[PDB]
Design a binder for this molecule. Structure first.
Ligand SMILES: O=C(O)[C@]1(F)CN(c2ncnc3[nH]c4cc(F)ccc4c23)C[C@H]1C1CC1
Length: 167
């Protein structure tokens, strides 16, 4: 039993809710919140900009030190950093950005990072400003992630399309 509330169950291990991931994280304080990161951990907009703003820019300060030490992530890769006031940990995962011409097949590799964590609160990778089809992203999620994932979808219209079209 866990503290996630109001989710629709899609499969044995995947759950979905129309929610603001920032508000959901502040209420649940999950062990892991997933950020929709880029390789530079520059959290300017989308999910990343919202999560960072909610940390009063502490996420960005920590991220800049991480990059200065380690260099950029790989597309499809991840790193674990602090969850600040939102979660114990933040798993920064880089899905391909279609608006940068990155290979959509890397979306599966991105979701494989979730399997290193028993339970996660997450957005749909590569959705939103990353330019992928969220229906495709949900399919890859369900077919790749084996651990327990609670997906927060900000847009109510999109949440209903995702549910209604789910096979
Ligand atoms: O970055 C994008 O465009 C997204 F679509 C946004 N979306 C979200 N998902 C769940 N909660 C969200 N709260 C927010 C608050 C904001 F001010 C802006 C975006 C969100 C948001 C996932 C993200 C996709 C991986 C690309």
């Amino acid at each position: 039993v866990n503290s996630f509330s109001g989710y629709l169950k899609l499969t044995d291990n995947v759950y979905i809710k129309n929610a603001d991931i920032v508000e959901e994280a502040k209420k649940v304080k999950p062990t892991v919140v997933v950020n929709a990161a880029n390789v530079y951990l520059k959290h300017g907009g989308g999910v990343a900009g919202a999560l960072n703003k909610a940390t009063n820019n502490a996420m960005q300060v920590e991220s800049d030190d991480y990059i200065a030490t380690n260099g950029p992530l790989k597309v499809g890769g991840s790193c674990v950093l602090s969850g600040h006031n939102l979660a114990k940990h933040c798993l920064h995962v880089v899905g391909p950005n279609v608006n940068k011409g990155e290979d959509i097949q890397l979306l599966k590799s991105a979701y494989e990072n979730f399997n290193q964590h028993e339970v996660l609160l997450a957005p749909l990778l590569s959705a939103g400003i990353f330019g992928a089809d969220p229906i495709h992203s949900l399919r890859v999620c369900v077919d790749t992630v084996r651990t327990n994932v609670y997906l927060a979808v900000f847009d109510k219209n999109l949440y209903d399309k995702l549910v209604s079209s789910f096979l």
